[PDB]
Amino acid sequence: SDPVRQYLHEIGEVLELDKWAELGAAAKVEEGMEAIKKLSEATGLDQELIREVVRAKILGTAAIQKIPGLKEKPDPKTVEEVDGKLKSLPKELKRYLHIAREGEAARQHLIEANLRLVVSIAKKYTGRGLSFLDLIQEGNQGLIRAVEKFEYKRGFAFSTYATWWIRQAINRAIADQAR
């Protein structure tokens, strides 16, 4: 059945989260990136290289793995070996590996929750040259930029912040033919 109809279904079943819950996921995400920085400083690997591999594992068991607009699945081989240079670390270092993961699983739950918030926003930009799908792909990347640039360390809502990014990402994408 039309792949897009499939996706709309899959995110329909996703449970929306409350205010603090989304900030509880952001604070966990940065604590996970504080832990990558360390796993980096040890193993010697590029921070991002570690991120994508950890995300690789977590994404392993997510309800939604194929998200439109997102470059999923790093080299399965590259993951194979990065697992090694990791899961063979000191007693003390294995700890920052669980935190790395919890901050990445958090990032996924924080993304999954706001996929519908994205379908809705995109529903208001149709008939402007870009198909529904193309909008979802620009929105999602707008959602990605949002989860990343967010400061959990302040009493602001994620749903509100995120909206902006999803917004001007979509209307930047329909401004990339026109203005």
Curated annotation (Swiss-Prot):
<feature type="region of interest" description="Sigma-70 factor domain-2">
    <location>
        <begin position="110"/>
        <end position="179"/>
    </location>
</feature>
<comment type="similarity">
    <text>Belongs to the sigma-70 factor family. RpoD/SigA subfamily.</text>
</comment>
<protein>
    <recommendedName>
        <fullName>RNA polymerase sigma factor SigA</fullName>
    </recommendedName>
</protein>
<comment type="function">
    <text>Sigma factors are initiation factors that promote the attachment of RNA polymerase to specific initiation sites and are then released. This sigma factor is the primary sigma factor during exponential growth.</text>
</comment>
<comment type="subunit">
    <text>Interacts transiently with the RNA polymerase catalytic core formed by RpoA, RpoB, RpoC and RpoZ (2 alpha, 1 beta, 1 beta' and 1 omega subunit) to form the RNA polymerase holoenzyme that can initiate transcription.</text>
</comment>
<feature type="short sequence motif" description="Interaction with polymerase core subunit RpoC">
    <location>
        <begin position="134"/>
        <end position="137"/>
    </location>
</feature>
